[PDB]
Nucleic acid binder design. Structure first.
Length: 270
DNA sequence: GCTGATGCGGCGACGGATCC
DNA sequence: GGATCCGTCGAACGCATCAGC
């Protein structure tokens, strides 16, 4: 079954207008994504803040098109030192953040503090084929939760990006045949449930659309999975509970091409 | 400098068994 | 004997290194 994201809801449940638009995109190769016109899509989306994951690009190789985004002029990039062509994340913002830091105290995490909230974008480590990196993922999950818990102690938190797990069976097309697969192990799902519990956080999209199936943000390049919408929901906006009144909508931009992930977009009334 | 090989890291199609 | 359940396997991508010119 194909999926059609509902129209953008730009007013909070109470009736306040959205003032902040955040777009998160796992671009799977920033340079390839730019050549596949992904930045033309960003310009049409016109977000206040853009978070990118899996850029696979060091700062000295960023294409000059990125210096031509005047409404996203404050840019922060993080790549691994060891493995240049892998991982990597970026955060672009219309306004300067108050503070920016990297890591969770790998080029996987950027933390940016704004006036009324802290934003984290993450490329969560994949468990690997054959689950060869699942134990590392479990240790990483626990270190990440502890780091996030110790941030939400100040302002509310928005966490976005590729969290590399489909939380529940509704979050992927083939839950039964993938329960031993990276992204849908009981270990990764439980780690997600624990993140929501411990910090605490809510899944923005699931909060608004608790029963909507076939909503995915990732499709393997092979076996024409995307045209069949055989996909996984791996990309999220998770919010502190104190931000749920401010939540207008959480979108999945199914039609935007240029990666094996599609963009996601958050509308907040702050 | 440039190309294209190879290497590495991000599962759905399918073939076979079991169940009523 | 259709539905379901399970383990096996081939392959689209992006980017790195490397050879060769």
């Amino acid at each position: 079954a194909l999926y059609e994201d509902p129209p953008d809801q730009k007013t909070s449940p109470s009736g306040k207008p959205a003032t902040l638009k955040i777009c998160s995109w796992n671009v799977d190769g920033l340079r390839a994504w730019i050549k596949k016109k992904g930045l033309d899509w960003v310009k049409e989306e016109a977000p206040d803040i853009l978070c990118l994951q899996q850029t696979k690009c060091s700062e000295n190789k960023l294409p000059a098109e990125l210096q031509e985004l005047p409404g996203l002029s404050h840019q922060y990039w993080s790549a691994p030192s060891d493995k240049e062509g892998y991982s990597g994340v970026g955060l672009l913002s219309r306004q300067a953040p108050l503070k920016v830091s990297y890591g969770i105290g790998e080029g996987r995490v950027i933390v940016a503090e704004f006036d009324s909230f802290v934003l984290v974008t993450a490329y969560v480590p994949n468990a690997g084929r054959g689950l060869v990196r699942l134990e590392y993922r479990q240790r990483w999950d626990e270190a990440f939760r502890k780091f996030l818990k110790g941030l939400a102690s100040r302002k509310p938190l928005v966490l976005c990006g590729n969290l590399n797990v489909a939380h529940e069976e509704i979050d992927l097309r083939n839950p039964k045949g993938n329960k031993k697969n990276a992204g849908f192990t009981p270990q990764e799902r439980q780690g997600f449930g624990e993140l929501l519990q411990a910090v605490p956080l809510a899944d923005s999209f699931r909060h608004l659309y608790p029963n909507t199936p076939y909503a995915y943000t990732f499709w393997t390049y092979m076996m024409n999975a995307r045209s069949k919408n055989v996909g996984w929901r791996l990309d999220y906006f998770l919010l502190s509970h104190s931000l749920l009144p401010a939540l207008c909508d959480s979108k999945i931009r199914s039609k935007a091409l240029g990666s094996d992930h599609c963009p996601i977009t958050l509308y907040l009334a702050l």
